[PDB]
Design a protein around this ligand. Structure first.
Ligand SMILES: [Zn+2]
Lengths: 63, 337, 108, 5, 126, 172, 146, 64
């Protein structure tokens, strides 16, 4: 997943390093997510999803 | 032999029909050829709320196609002014240059777009006619007058947080006249643009051009402009005796007002409009047979909320005028043959 | 005025004036659907339908098949006029209502 | 809630 | 991808005025075909939608720890009660309008808030 | 997928469309390019003129089939068993074979669907359906045309007037 | 242009149990003819109940003056004397005529199956008065309660 | 990283309610009451602040 990989840029000099701009913390998450603070490094975003067949372009695994 | 001319009936396992039976040939006698006077007689607009940045008129007696045309005009065709180009002279912030440009594009400007015009294709320079320029130049320094404290505003702070207040209008041409001193400004003075630490500096020039919310959302002038058909609730039977309260709880609370006509308690449908469709009566198994909830046929409720560029009523007026402009453009292009 | 941001008409097989397909450029379901609703009110048209050719493109196709007599370009040019009349009336009514409410609220 | 009083 | 193994490519960017708007003014930002459920049986996504919608509504933060909700105390019962306590409906369905025809669709749609991850595989690299 | 749940819910017996939903559903499946669109007559003419949804598929079928060639006849079975619709215990009528008039038997008579749901058994990867017979009598390009137009029609239906979802009150 | 006229009375509202949404299958039985009728009727438009009578007619033209029908629908037609003494009018085609099963017996009864888009009807009775029908023939089903 | 300027679903501007949100939470108010007192009615906006993780305060701690 493209997420927030670390806090120290300008210092790493890796090869590739994927960064997500504005991560959020899940509103629904297991309590263990909070024991190892995993919000120091978020991984995705909350989205308003509707489960509907409306377009003709979202079939067979496409979104 | 039973006609229902005005409501969209509904149960739980699905809605009954998708028609409105008000078109040509849609009945034995109730045929239509677009009587314009019947429209002008059955149409009425009522305005429930109008704060600044809100409107909730009714728009009674119009079809779903015209209402949807109005809604889609406000979201994607009424023009607004917004930052398109960003020239960055220095930027030692943590916020990137492309991310700063993005964040600056989504800031709403209070210029009215009706006094401007569209930049011609490849008009990089721009002129007083089509562009507005603003400048953000901020640097963060430690304040000399500070004790051994750790509040970020008290120390480490001359400009720790860069806000929309820091953006200054550079009158491009003769625009200083025409626009009085406070008229062209960002709409909100508290939008956090970035954060700085001592020694860090932002310095840039933003150019705002005209455009519609269709080619980019940044140019869209309304938070939402949706509409909803007016609900209809009918008590087929007099509910009473502590079932009235269970009825009053299966609805948004204002809709069923439980009066006390006698020693017993009667539930009455006080205000059908407050109802949100939650269909929680359909879980009751004894009162799903007592109430019929549907929608009024051509009675809408609109709600327009502007970002702050123009007032909502002016937004609706310009939407109607944009639809008229589409129609007139095509009429006059047809007359060209 | 604009040679192709606007109308391109394709008369059908046999160039039947009573069966025309208008291509309207830079239009989406808004004008398409409102104009199709306004053209369906004409008892002299037997088939009106619009459709978007492809998502990537910005253009719609109206199809008007009128009855034996009229050339199917009068139904289009009359649906346009009726839609613009309805918009003008809605604008007048809405502005009058807003003014009345502003007065009622500023008085009290 | 309720068009103007 | 979601947190339940439902990966898929992005096929369209649907205009914001052609999306089906809800009776509350909202408009989804992800459209997910309902045919990935029947064969993959990811019933955890249908519970995460309701849990996240209830969270966003009440300002809460629910836990999705495995084995905390039994047959007697179900997850759907719990989160449907949470939703019905906010004025929405038990089963998590709110009814939308068609952003293209402007008519209230006959079926009421299942909408909610779910947590999406973005994968590192992009057409720009393949 | 949803071209099968769309076509099975439109071709079911209780789907009635007004002139304007009938149209704009025919032309949106066709997107026809040449020649007039040959329409049908309302099944119900009186209390209010209304169409049937099987008539939408019919009128979409008589425009796709090549002009010179004549519409096809077809008799077969549907995938949805005629027992799927039995809500309430079945009673016995003396002279009625329940299957003589059932949504389980597909009967296309001169290109006009007269009975049957037209689920996967047609439109699908199953043999001897409507598209397989189209491919036999009129060739492989006409079956491809039928597939394209039927996909477009069944998408317009779910996107305009109906909707498909899968909540929790259907797995409950 | 009438092919059949009679006064029925509803006996069963839906015996098979298959239940559709807006359609109801009536099992009637004629009077003074003892003909049988199975009829799918749209009950959202035209509610029908048990123990209900209605005059039923099948025609090949609505003009009742000889002129054939053109197969085109105009809601703008200027000949307005078409049968309107009837509340519920349909329009379908006969798709199956099948002589009854009984062999070694007279059994000269016919069952005529008509389709009205998707709403099927079956008229069963003495062949003598079901001769006007023939497969692939368009017919109107006019009805009027009593 | 930093507060989004506009809500992603409906472009309501929420980039000016970050400091106000933080101030109403320091005063003892629940996240629900706090999001109400800011004007965030529909839950698409409420999730934009409720689930925001301010990582600009942790990046602004490594040397210049
Ligand atoms: Zn929002």
């Amino acid at each position: 997943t493209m997420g927030f990989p670390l806090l120290t840029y300008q210092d790493r000099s890796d090869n590739k390093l994927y960064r997500l701009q504005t991560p959020q913390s899940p509103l629904v998450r297991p309590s263990m997510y909070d024991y190892y603070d995993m919000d120091n490094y978020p991984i995705g975003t909350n989205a308003i999803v509707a489960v509907i067949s409306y377009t003709g372009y979202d079939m067979e695994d496409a979104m | 032999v039973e006609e229902m001319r005005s409501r969209v009936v509904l149960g739980e396992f699905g809605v009954r029909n998708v028609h409105t039976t008000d078109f040509p040939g849609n009945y034995s006698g109730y045929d239509d050829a677009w009587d314009q006077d019947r429209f002008e007689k059955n149409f009425r607009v009522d305005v429930v709320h109008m704060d600044e940045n809100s409107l909730e008129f009714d728009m009674v007696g119009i079809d779903a196609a015209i209402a949807n045309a109005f809604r889609r005009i406000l979201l994607a065709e009424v023009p607004t002014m917004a930052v398109e180009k960003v020239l960055v002279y220095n930027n030692t912030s943590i916020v990137q240059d492309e991310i700063l440009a993005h964040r600056l594009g989504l800031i709403p400007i209070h210029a009215d777009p009706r006094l401007f015009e569209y930049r011609n294709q490849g008009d990089e320079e721009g002129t007083e006619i089509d562009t507005l320029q603003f400048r953000l130049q901020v640097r963060c320094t430690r304040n000399p007058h500070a004790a051994k404290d750790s509040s970020d505003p008290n120390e480490l702070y001359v400009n720790h947080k860069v806000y929309t207040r820091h953006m200054t209008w550079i009158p491009l041409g003769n625009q200083a006249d025409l626009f009085p001193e406070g008229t062209i400004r960002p709409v909100h003075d508290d939008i956090l643009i970035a954060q700085l630490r001592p020694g860090q500096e932002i310095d840039l020039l933003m150019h705002c051009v005209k455009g519609i919310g269709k080619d980019h959302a940044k140019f869209s002038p309304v938070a939402t402009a949706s509409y909803r058909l007016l609900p209809d609730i009918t008590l087929l039977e007099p509910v009473e005796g502590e079932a009235a309260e269970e009825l009053s709880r299966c609805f948004s609370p204002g809709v069923i007002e439980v009066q006390e006509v006698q020693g017993k308690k009667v539930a009455r449908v006080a205000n059908p409009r407050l109802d949100t469709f939650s269909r929680e009566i359909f879980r009751n198994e004894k009162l799903k047979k007592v109430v019929r909830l549907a929608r009024v046929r051509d009675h809408y409720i609109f709600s327009v909320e502007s970002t702050g560029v123009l007032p909502p009523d002016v937004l609706v007026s310009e939407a109607i005028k944009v639809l008229m402009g589409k129609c007139r453009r095509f009429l006059d292009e047809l007359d060209a043959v | 005025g604009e040679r192709k941001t606007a109308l391109e008409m394709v008369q059908a097989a046999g160039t039947d004036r009573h069966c025309v397909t208008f291509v309207l450029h830079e239009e989406d379901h808004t004008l398409g659907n409102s104009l199709r609703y306004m053209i369906m009110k004409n008892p002299e048209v037997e088939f009106c339908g619009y459709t978007t050719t492809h998502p990537s493109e910005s253009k719609i196709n109206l199809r008007i098949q009128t009855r034996g007599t009229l050339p199917a370009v009068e139904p289009f040019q009359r649906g346009l006029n009726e839609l613009m009349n309805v918009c003008q009336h809605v604008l007048d009514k809405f502005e009058a209502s807003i003014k009345d409410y502003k007065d009622q609220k500023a008085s009290r | 809630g309720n068009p103007p009083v | 991808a979601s947190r339940h193994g439902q990966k898929g490519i992005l096929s369209r960017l649907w205009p914001a005025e052609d999306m089906p708007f809800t009776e509350s003014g909202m408009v989804p930002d992800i459209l997910f075909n309902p045919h990935g459920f029947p064969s993959r049986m990811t019933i955890g996504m249908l519970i995460e939608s309701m849990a996240g919608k209830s969270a966003a509504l009440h300002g809460l933060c629910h836990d999705a720890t495995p084995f905390i909700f039994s047959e007697e105390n179900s997850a759907l019962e719990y989160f449907g009660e949470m939703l019905k306590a906010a004025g929405y409906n038990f089963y998590g369905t709110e009814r939308l309008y068609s952003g293209i025809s402007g008519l209230e669709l006959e079926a009421d749609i299942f909408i909610g808030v779910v947590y999406y991850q973005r994968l590192r595989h992009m057409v720009s690299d393949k | 997928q949803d071209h099968m749940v769309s076509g099975a819910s439109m071709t079911t017996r209780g789907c009635f469309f007004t002139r304007e939903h009938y149209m704009e559903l025919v032309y949106r499946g066709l997107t026809d390019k040449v020649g007039r669109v040959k329409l049908l007559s309302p099944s119900i003419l009186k209390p209010f003129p209304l169409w049937t949804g099987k008539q939408v598929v019919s009128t979409l079928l008589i425009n796709i089939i090549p002009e010179d060639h004549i519409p096809l006849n077809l008799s077969g079975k549907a995938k949805i068993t005629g027992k799927a619709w039995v809500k309430e215990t079945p009673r016995s009528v003396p002279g009625f074979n329940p299957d003589s008039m059932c949504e389980s038997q597909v009967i296309i008579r001169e290109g006009e669907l007269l009975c049957g749901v037209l689920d996967k058994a047609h439109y699908g990867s199953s043999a001897y359906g409507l598209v397989h017979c189209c491919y036999e009598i009129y060739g492989g390009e006409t079956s491809g045309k039928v597939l394209t137009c039927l996909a477009r029609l069944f998408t317009a239906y779910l996107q305009l007037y109906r909707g498909f979802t899968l909540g929790v009150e259907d797995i409950l | 242009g009438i092919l059949f006229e009679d006064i029925f009375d509803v006996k069963d509202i839906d015996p098979e149990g298959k239940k559709f949404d807006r359609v109801s299958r009536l099992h009637c039985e004629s009077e003074s003819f003892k003909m049988d009728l199975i009829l799918d009727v749209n009950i959202q438009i035209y509610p029908v109940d048990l123990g209900d009578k209605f005059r039923l007619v099948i025609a090949s033209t609505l003009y009742e003056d000889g002129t054939l029908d053109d197969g085109e629908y105009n809601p703008t037609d200027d000949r307005p004397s078409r049968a309107d003494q009837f509340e519920y009018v349909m329009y379908g085609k006969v798709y199956r005529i099948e002589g009854d099963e009984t062999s070694t017996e007279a059994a000269t009864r016919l069952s005529a199956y008509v389709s009205y888009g998707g709403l099927l009807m079956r008229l069963q009775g003495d062949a003598n008065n079901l001769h006007g029908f023939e497969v692939d023939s368009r017919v109107y089903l006019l009805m009027k309660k009593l | 990283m930093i507060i989004p300027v506009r809500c992603f679903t409906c472009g309501k501007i929420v980039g000016n309610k970050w400091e106000a949100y933080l101030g109403l939470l320091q005063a003892e108010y629940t996240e629900g009451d706090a999001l109400d007192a800011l004007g965030l009615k529909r839950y698409c906006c409420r999730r934009m602040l409720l689930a925001h993780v301010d990582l600009i305060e942790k990046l602004l701690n490594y040397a210049p």
